[PDB]
Amino acid sequence: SEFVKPYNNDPFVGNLSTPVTTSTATKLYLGNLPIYRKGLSPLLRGLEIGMAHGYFLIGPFYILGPLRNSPNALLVGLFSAFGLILILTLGLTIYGLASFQGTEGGENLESAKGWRNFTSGFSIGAFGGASVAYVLLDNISFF
Amino acid sequence: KVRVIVDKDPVATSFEKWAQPGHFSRTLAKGPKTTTWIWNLHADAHDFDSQTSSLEDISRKIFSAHFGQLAIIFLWVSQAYFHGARFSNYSAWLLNPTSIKPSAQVVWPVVGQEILNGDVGGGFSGVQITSGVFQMWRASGITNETELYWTAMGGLMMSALMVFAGWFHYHKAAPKLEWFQNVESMMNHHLAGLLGLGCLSWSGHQIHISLPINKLLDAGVAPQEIPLPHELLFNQDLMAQLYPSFKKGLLPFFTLNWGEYSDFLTFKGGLNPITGSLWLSDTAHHHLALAVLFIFAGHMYRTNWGIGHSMKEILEAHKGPLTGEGHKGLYEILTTSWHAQLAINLAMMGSLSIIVAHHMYAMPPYPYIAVDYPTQLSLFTHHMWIGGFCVCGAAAHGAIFMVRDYSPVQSYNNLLDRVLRHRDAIISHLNWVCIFLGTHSFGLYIHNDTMRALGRPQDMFSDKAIQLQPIFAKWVQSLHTLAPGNTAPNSLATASYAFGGDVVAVNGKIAMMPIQLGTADFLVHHIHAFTIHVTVLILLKGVLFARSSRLIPDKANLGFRFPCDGPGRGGTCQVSAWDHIFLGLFWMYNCISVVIFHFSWKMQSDVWGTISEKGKITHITGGNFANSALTINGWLRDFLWSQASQVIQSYGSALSAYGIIFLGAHFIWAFSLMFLFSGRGYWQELIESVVWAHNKLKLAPAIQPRALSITQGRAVGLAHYLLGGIGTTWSFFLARIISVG
Amino acid sequence: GDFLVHHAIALGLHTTTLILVKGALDARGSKLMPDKKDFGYSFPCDGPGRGGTCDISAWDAFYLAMFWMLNTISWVTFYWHWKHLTVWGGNAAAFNESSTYIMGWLRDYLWLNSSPLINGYNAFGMNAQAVWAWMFLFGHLIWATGFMFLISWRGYWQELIETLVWAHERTPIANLVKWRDKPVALSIVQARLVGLAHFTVGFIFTFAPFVIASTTGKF
Amino acid sequence: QAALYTHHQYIAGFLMVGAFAHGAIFFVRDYDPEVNKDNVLARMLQHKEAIISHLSWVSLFLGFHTLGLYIHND
Amino acid sequence: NGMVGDCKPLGYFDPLGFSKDASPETMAKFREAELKHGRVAMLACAGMITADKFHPLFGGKLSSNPLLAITQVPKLGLLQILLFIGFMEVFGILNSRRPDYEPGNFLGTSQWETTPTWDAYQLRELNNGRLAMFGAIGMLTHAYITGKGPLELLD
Amino acid sequence: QQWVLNPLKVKPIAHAIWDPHFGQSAIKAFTRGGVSYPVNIATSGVYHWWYTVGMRTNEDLYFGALGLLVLST
Numbered sequence A: 001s002e003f004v005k006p007y008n009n010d011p012f013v014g015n016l017s018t019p020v021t022t023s024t025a026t027k028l029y030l031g032n033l034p035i036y037r038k039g040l041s042p043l044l045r046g047l048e049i050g051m052a053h054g055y056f057l058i059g060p061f062y063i064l065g066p067l068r069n070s071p072n073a074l075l076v077g078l079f080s081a082f083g084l085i086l087i088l089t090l091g092l093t094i095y096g097l098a099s100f101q102g103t104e105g106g107e108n109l110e111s112a113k114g115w116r117n118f119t120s121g122f123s124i125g126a127f128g129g130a131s132v133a134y135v136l137l138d139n140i141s142f143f
Numbered sequence B: 001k002v003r004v005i006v007d008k009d010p011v012a013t014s015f016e017k018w019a020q021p022g023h024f025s026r027t028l029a030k031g032p033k034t035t036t037w038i039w040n041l042h043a044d045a046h047d048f049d050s051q052t053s054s055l056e057d058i059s060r061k062i063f064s065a066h067f068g069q070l071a072i073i074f075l076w077v078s079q080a081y082f083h084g085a086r087f088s089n090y091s092a093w094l095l096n097p098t099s100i101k102p103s104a105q106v107v108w109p110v111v112g113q114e115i116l117n118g119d120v121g122g123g124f125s126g127v128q129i130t131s132g133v134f135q136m137w138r139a140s141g142i143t144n145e146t147e148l149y150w151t152a153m154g155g156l157m158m159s160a161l162m163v164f165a166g167w168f169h170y171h172k173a174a175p176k177l178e179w180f181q182n183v184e185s186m187m188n189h190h191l192a193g194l195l196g197l198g199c200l201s202w203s204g205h206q207i208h209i210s211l212p213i214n215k216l217l218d219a220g221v222a223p224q225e226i227p228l229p230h231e232l233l234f235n236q237d238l239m240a241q242l243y244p245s246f247k248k249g250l251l252p253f254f255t256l257n258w259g260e261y262s263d264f265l266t267f268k269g270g271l272n273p274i275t276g277s278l279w280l281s282d283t284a285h286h287h288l289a290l291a292v293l294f295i296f297a298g299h300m301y302r303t304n305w306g307i308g309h310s311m312k313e314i315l316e317a318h319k320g321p322l323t324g325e326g327h328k329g330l331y332e333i334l335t336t337s338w339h340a341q342l343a344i345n346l347a348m349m350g351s352l353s354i355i356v357a358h359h360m361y362a363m364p365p366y367p368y369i370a371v372d373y374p375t376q377l378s379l380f381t382h383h384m385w386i387g388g389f390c391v392c393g394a395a396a397h398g399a400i401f402m403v404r405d406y407s408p409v410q411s412y413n414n415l416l417d418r419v420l421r422h423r424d425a426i427i428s429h430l431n432w433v434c435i436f437l438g439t440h441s442f443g444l445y446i447h448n449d450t451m452r453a454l455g456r457p458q459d460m461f462s463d464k465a466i467q468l469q470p471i472f473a474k475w476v477q478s479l480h481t482l483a484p485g486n487t488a489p490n491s492l493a494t495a496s497y498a499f500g501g502d503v504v505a506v507n508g509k510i511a512m513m514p515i516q517l518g519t520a521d522f523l524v525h526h527i528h529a530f531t532i533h534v535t536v537l538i539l540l541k542g543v544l545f546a547r548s549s550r551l552i553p554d555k556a557n558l559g560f561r562f563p564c565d566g567p568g569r570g571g572t573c574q575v576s577a578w579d580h581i582f583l584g585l586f587w588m589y590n591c592i593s594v595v596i597f598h599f600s601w602k603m604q605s606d607v608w609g610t611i612s613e614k615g616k617i618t619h620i621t622g623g624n625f626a627n628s629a630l631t632i633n634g635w636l637r638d639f640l641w642s643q644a645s646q647v648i649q650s651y652g653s654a655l656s657a658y659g660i661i662f663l664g665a666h667f668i669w670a671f672s673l674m675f676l677f678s679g680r681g682y683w684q685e686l687i688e689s690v691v692w693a694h695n696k697l698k699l700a701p702a703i704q705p706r707a708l709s710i711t712q713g714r715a716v717g718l719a720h721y722l723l724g725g726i727g728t729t730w731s732f733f734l735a736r737i738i739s740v741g
Numbered sequence C: 001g002d003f004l005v006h007h008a009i010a011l012g013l014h015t016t017t018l019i020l021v022k023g024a025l026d027a028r029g030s031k032l033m034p035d036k037k038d039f040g041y042s043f044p045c046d047g048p049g050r051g052g053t054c055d056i057s058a059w060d061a062f063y064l065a066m067f068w069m070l071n072t073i074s075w076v077t078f079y080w081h082w083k084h085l086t087v088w089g090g091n092a093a094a095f096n097e098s099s100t101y102i103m104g105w106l107r108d109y110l111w112l113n114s115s116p117l118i119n120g121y122n123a124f125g126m127n128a129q130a131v132w133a134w135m136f137l138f139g140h141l142i143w144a145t146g147f148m149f150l151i152s153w154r155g156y157w158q159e160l161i162e163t164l165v166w167a168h169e170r171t172p173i174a175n176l177v178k179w180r181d182k183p184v185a186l187s188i189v190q191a192r193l194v195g196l197a198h199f200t201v202g203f204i205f206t207f208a209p210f211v212i213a214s215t216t217g218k219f
Numbered sequence D: 001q002a003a004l005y006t007h008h009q010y011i012a013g014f015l016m017v018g019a020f021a022h023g024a025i026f027f028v029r030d031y032d033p034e035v036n037k038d039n040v041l042a043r044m045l046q047h048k049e050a051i052i053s054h055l056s057w058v059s060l061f062l063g064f065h066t067l068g069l070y071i072h073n074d
Numbered sequence E: 001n002g003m004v005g006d007c008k009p010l011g012y013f014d015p016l017g018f019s020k021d022a023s024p025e026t027m028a029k030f031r032e033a034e035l036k037h038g039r040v041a042m043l044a045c046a047g048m049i050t051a052d053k054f055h056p057l058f059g060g061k062l063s064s065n066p067l068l069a070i071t072q073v074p075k076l077g078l079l080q081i082l083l084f085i086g087f088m089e090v091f092g093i094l095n096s097r098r099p100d101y102e103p104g105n106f107l108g109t110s111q112w113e114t115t116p117t118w119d120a121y122q123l124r125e126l127n128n129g130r131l132a133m134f135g136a137i138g139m140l141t142h143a144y145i146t147g148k149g150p151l152e153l154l155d
Numbered sequence F: 001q002q003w004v005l006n007p008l009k010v011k012p013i014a015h016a017i018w019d020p021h022f023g024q025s026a027i028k029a030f031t032r033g034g035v036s037y038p039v040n041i042a043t044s045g046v047y048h049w050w051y052t053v054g055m056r057t058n059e060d061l062y063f064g065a066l067g068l069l070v071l072s073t
Ligand code: CLA
Pocket: B430, B431, B432, B434, B435, B436, B437, B438, B439, B442, B443, B446, B534, B537, B538, B583, B586, B587, C141, C144, C145, C146, C147, C148, C149, C151, C152, C156, C160
């Protein structure tokens, strides 16, 4: 048998159609991720990605941060998450400015308006996710 | 059939081609026109496949070169034995091993060097040795100097025989390629005939000469009163007196009542309390079992008779969905190309040297070698360095095979083709692994330094601030500690006391001790993994991208080692697989240097030392590894600065030679940087100015001087760098360990 | 000791002048490259032809002589610092005795006076010289990182960047984020410059710490 | 005192290297042999081979002998 | 027909003829259920075998009894296991919804040139799944009866 | 001003340290020079230079800084 064939029946493209690259599991999961999901607007793509990253970003600061052994450990973790998210959304905005200089199409991540909607979604979502993880970690004794 | 087929008188014996210097190569045979000719004569000396196209001739040259090398090695074994016979204190050490410093070299009084004949005990003045040959001979049972003298003479006879064999097998009766390509019979004879019979013979030697002599020495009999080996060999009554099972003869062997030999064939394990080393009965049983295993293994491959395997068929039968044709063509590759075989063999030899280094220190095999702290450190470090060098040689010869002997007609859609077809994925993923591993492993050290300097020990990656415990290593150590009862019931002790158990100590000094693993061990082990991974990255990229790359599609046409392909494409510098090896040698050097530093500090702080009558364990450095190895500042202070005292304060003492070599190796390491950083163009222009100065005086040579080639400059820089660094570590370790231990 | 170290200083000055004067005089042309002025001041090379033409541009003469400038100034400053530490401490018969051999410099100047620096912070605590210890190690690290750019040259890193470009372009999710400038390995003169930069900054950081902390800890 | 001496000696070395580098840039960029026909500056290029060879000689002598005496003492 | 579940000891084993006069949809549902049961039972049997004598997690002293261990596990761990399994099952449902869909192939084997070797290894998967299906039920039943784990029951 | 009274004993201060990464131990260690905050001990000789030149109070140094700022402007 042969589970490694040319990518899209093109032997001269620099890729291989391995199980990892071209399996139905990989295709399903990637195509269903928000950045690839069909029908999602750029705002919702950014929103889902933002909440996703903001929920987990608080944790390293909370437990491994300098004030882990302090009564305000989770507060400092949330503030650190907000700062890191501010840096990340600044990076997103400058990336959009540098890449999609001249664009008018919109409704597309590869355009200025679409990337701006995506960045707004990411920023709000990540702030909300950091706050939500703060709220859950305050009341973790519930579970 | 497998048969002997050789050509007679293939090459005449004459000094005419000794006189003709560059005869071996077509270009060099013309004669010199520049000084680069002189260097190329040495560079292409042993490149037989560039000299002659015939694989038969290449094989014959290689075979006789192997003979010459064995002659050199026999002369080296002879030097060891003869120096022990004559210019040594082996008898004094044999009488009193713990206090006597082993020494088998003496300097002559000429220019004040006579101080180097330091006080080594036993009424003998000489240079202390650290090779462990004294302990080797004690294990072998040598108790007199006549034995050392006569085995040295035998070694000289064998060296002469090997020179004769090398001459004969190239000038009088050279084999054919058909003879050389009998890989199946070669494997059969090397397994059963070389390894198997070697182990069987050594087991017999041990059982007959080493067990009785060593047991009597441990009992207390002085070497003078020990019965001689020839008496012991046939005196069955004495051997029955020592080991009662010998009175039963060989009938318990021929009948399968092998349990009768339990006394002198044991599975005791651990270390002998007297000598603080492995039990020689255990070693005899070990070698006997290995002899049986190798003789059993050597009857696998096909020969003149119908039974046996074909490695071609075995390889061709292994092909999977993700591998296409699988191992098809590899048998032909390894039968046709010597460089592929050299690559594999060098890789395994180097890994074996490293495994030897790891095994000997944890399980001291020779008597009174564990207490001989210089010997353990020297052997471990030496074998580590040899292993790294062999691994890089493996990578280099793999690249050479790729450049020269690779062919798609042969290796189409096999594992080699499939590996080349995703080399980019391989190297990119190894690059990510290297970045991740180095970032974590070194940034933990850097974090520790930062927090210590900021006065925040509570934020450290220490054993008491943020613990990174090697839970898996601790679990494996616990399993090995509990092994002798549950999973190895016939074993009476653990394989090595490093995992756990009692503190073996001979006299006051400590032979072996359990080695604890904590946060520092976690950090340094991940550092080791990072260094190994970067070395593998460099070497594997060199091997894979020897044919071509996205930068140079025709890299194979240029050759294996070439300077560049010009300043185009932004610069194509060191694109060659040779230059990849040149860079990987720096990285294995760094890897082995960190490994030996870890070994030295850990053994000095946690294992080596002394134990008093009550049990006051006092280590050489005082257990500072666990709390100081967490920072690079601690590595710089408590290991290099702290232990350099015994080197730098060595002037006016017997270790002053180590001090001089410390400085000289430093000098050579720095001298290497000239070649490593500089370039041929400047040097050729400087030589032009000097050549004008000479031509003004009518003495510019006919062989015009030239700056060294680019590849040669890189090679010279690498050689000087390695020599300087290795000599620095050599002098430092030897001076420190001889002074303190 | 002053005799010998002064002759060493003469060696340093003369060799730095040799490299620099040769670069200046051969910048226009040489027997290996008579038309160097056409290429200019700083170019990578002339190619592997004619035996190789590495570091031929007379900018590389400057880059080579920078190592010797650092070497000779280091010798000068070691001489100054050791003689003055001995004079200030009142034992000039340490310099007068030990400076005649090189192990005296390696032991009674570097090793002896490195203790208060490297003991800036240890397992038991920290002192006010911990910043000097950290900067000492910092300069060591930069000096070491310079060797990378000085030894390893562009072809290896270019091919490695081809591999990384392949990986970034082929992985999902991340390949939506795409560069504008094609990432390439550093040019030859650029990497010579970077390696020399890491060397020099390193030099100055290491000696600054060692010269400012050992003096403070010894007086 | 030590900080100031080290500082100013290092900057002196840098300034000297820069002076020579800009002399090289002048030679390769701004030097006009037609203007400097048989000049005091052109004669420097004329016997540059002698200059470089003798600087090589003195550097070699100094290094050989200083290193040798230091090793003798060592 | 068209599947790879047949074997030597029983041939094409269908005594009650469920597949007889059945649609390809029902056949695909049956094979998906078969492979899911086999895989889950492999995981179960391996989990009991390993955790009986080597259970370092959760303080290293949770009960070796399979039935008691899951009750001893914290609620959050059970919730996370359920979330993980559900996240695999949504992709199972999507693979079922796909136009090309073999029953248990998350790998998408149809796009590659497969052979009798692939068929034989699918048969290996299925046979091991059947054996593990019997094994897991046996282990749980013995755990309920005796209260010992698999290897302790063997002890 | 304190250094002027006792030049040979008081260690000159370069500037205050502002670092949130400092621990309590580093804070206590770097608190030196007869001040209540962490500081860096000057090794540039500017104190000696200005004292020799004629500066005796912080006001003179501040006015020098102001005038140099105007010069740069
Ligand atoms: C100390 C000296 C030094 C350093 C730092 C490096 C660094 C590196 N070498 Mg090596 N190298 C060296 C000497 C050194 N080399 C020398 C002398 C040579 C010549 C023989 C080479 C030759 C060489 C080759 C040929 C290759 C490497 C590779 C690498 C990389 C390994 C991946 C890694 O762990 O990166 C991680 C980075 C580090 C370990 C440095 C410290 C990182 C910590 C976390 C600090 C982080 C700081 C912060 C985030 C940023 C700055 C803060 C602020 C100022 C903004 C990396 C770039 C290999 C590679 O490409 O790997 C993929 C490779 O192929 N090196």
